[PDB]
Design a protein around this ligand. Structure first.
Ligand code: NAG
Ligand code: NAG
Ligand code: NAG
Ligand code: NAG
Lengths: 275, 155
């Protein structure tokens, strides 16, 4: 892989790398800080090799923006280094959230496809208590921070790399395929001088949407939502047409319910009186 | 006719929980991010999903926008994913539009969404690895149940 995003936050004390997404040619790394315009990096804990920039480990020293150039190629990163929680196994900013539904497939797996050849030991923590994988169907009490830790050999002393997942166990919605209530085709009676009010009604979900479709002043709308005794959302919407001409006469006015989960639509035709 | 209804802010992720964002070059890409990375790369991580009414309703019709420096709307023009600098319009007088997509949840998993292109029937927003990158592209479906055209939509 490689690191494509403009901004990046990592925790103090931990090994870290920056990989420029283009891979005996001329490379150049540069650093900006407060009063340092572009300090070309030429380190004699930082290592420059084969199109990557390594920190061993990264430090507060290192927050600032970084720039890479390979002839026709250029790249920019804002690097923000943060303080590590020294009393715990992880630090709250460095956490990655996950949502997993109650009775459902749930996995957590410790991996690194970069530093893997240096790894000597890798332990998994739950809320900082040791326990490499967790394969499982979810329980509410699987809510927690799972921390993956990796212990590394690098030229005389020990490093660790730690990633953490905030797992939230979520209740599942009772989601409904929205339905329209009533006949799918409808004939409505009215008189030319006057007005009609068409009501359209549907069973739908919180997120669902109910609307009218005419051609797009003598028209208007407005919406209402009430809960049924079986816990479902009952929604309705009225379309008003004021001084009916014949222009309003054989045209289909479609009311629709549209959901991420499905749709239904029903048409209304305006007729004079004789049927 | 397509016509604009409401909007939500959202954070899109792929089959590996890689976050969608717009890069310096206006290219939609995917990358691992902590919550702090997803928060601090905003506005490039925050996508506006705007909903539309449709005369021939095929799902949830939507546009996708971000605000980089200006606003940009995702297009499928010439079967290629790209960001066009435009605002999602009040309305669209066509049956298929390079900027309209149909959002449908994936049966059995309500968290997962597929985005079918309205201009090209059968084609779906997808995550592809191209070399060292992870890219949002348009593709006709490979396998059946292909996880690469499914996404999660959070906040
Ligand atoms: C490495 O992790 C160990 C045990 O989890 C912890 O005691 C130590 O603070 C960590 N080292 C660094 C440099 O953060
Ligand atoms: C973990 O989840 C809880 C519940 O949503 C949230 O309030 C908390 O901020 C999360 N922790 C982190 C570090 O984001
Ligand atoms: C529309 O119909 C619904 C369901 O039949 C009903 O509860 C509601 O009172 C009606 N609304 C108006 C404004 O007439
Ligand atoms: C929906 O309404 C349009 C215009 O009002 C009409 O032409 C169309 O045929 C209707 N759709 C269906 C599926 O009947």
């Amino acid at each position: 892989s490689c690191t494509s995003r403009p901004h990046i936050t990592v925790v103090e004390g931990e090994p870290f790398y920056l990989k420029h997404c283009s891979c005996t040619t001329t490379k150049s790394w540069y650093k900006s800080s407060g009063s340092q315009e572009h300090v070309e990096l030429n380190p004699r804990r930082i290592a420059l090799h084969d199109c990557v920039l390594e920190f061993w480990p990264v430090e507060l020293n290192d927050t600032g923006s970084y720039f890479f150039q390979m002839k026709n190629y250029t790249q920019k990163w804002k690097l923000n280094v943060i303080r590590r929680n020294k009393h715990s196994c992880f630090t709250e900013r460095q956490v990655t959230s996950k949502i997993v539904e109650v009775k459902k497939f749930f996995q957590i797996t410790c991996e690194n496809s970069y530093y893997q050849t240096l790894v000597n030991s890798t332990s998994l923590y739950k809320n900082c208590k040791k326990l490499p994988t967790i394969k499982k169907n979810a329980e509410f009490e699987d809510q927690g921070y799972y921390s993956c830790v990796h212990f590394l050999h690098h030229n005389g002393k020990l490093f660790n790399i730690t990633k953490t997942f905030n797992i939230t166990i979520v209740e599942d919605r009772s989601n409904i395929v929205p339905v329209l209530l009533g006949p799918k085709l409808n004939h409505v009676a009215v008189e030319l001088g006057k007005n009609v009010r068409l009501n359209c009604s549907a069973l739908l979900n919180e997120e669902d949407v109910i609307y009218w479709m005419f051609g797009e002043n003598i028209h208007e709308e407005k919406e209402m939502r009430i809960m049924t005794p079986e816990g479902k959302w009952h929604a309705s919407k009225v379309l008003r047409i004021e001084n009916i001409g014949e222009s309003n006469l054989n045209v289909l006015y479609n009311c629709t319910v549209a959901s991420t989960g499905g749709t239904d639509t029903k048409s209304f035709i305006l007729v004079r009186k004789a049927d | 006719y397509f016509g604009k209804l409401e909007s939500k802010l959202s954070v899109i992720r792929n089959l590996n929980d890689q976050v969608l964002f717009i890069d310096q070059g206006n290219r939609p890409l995917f990358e691992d991010m902590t919550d702090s990375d997803s928060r601090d790369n905003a506005p490039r991580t925050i996508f506006i999903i705007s909903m539309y009414k449709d005369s021939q309703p095929r799902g949830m019709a939507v546009t996708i926008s971000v605000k980089s420096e200006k606003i940009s709307t995702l297009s499928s023009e010439n079967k290629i994913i790209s960001f066009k600098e435009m605002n999602p319009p009040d309305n669209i007088k066509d049956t298929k539009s390079d900027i309209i997509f149909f959002q449908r949840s994936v049966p059995g998993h309500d968290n997962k969404m597929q985005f079918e292109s309205s201009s090209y029937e059968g084609y779906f927003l997808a995550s592809e690895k191209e070399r060292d990158l992870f890219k949002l592209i348009l593709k006709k479906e490979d396998e059946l149940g292909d996880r690469s055209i499914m996404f999660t939509v959070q906040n």
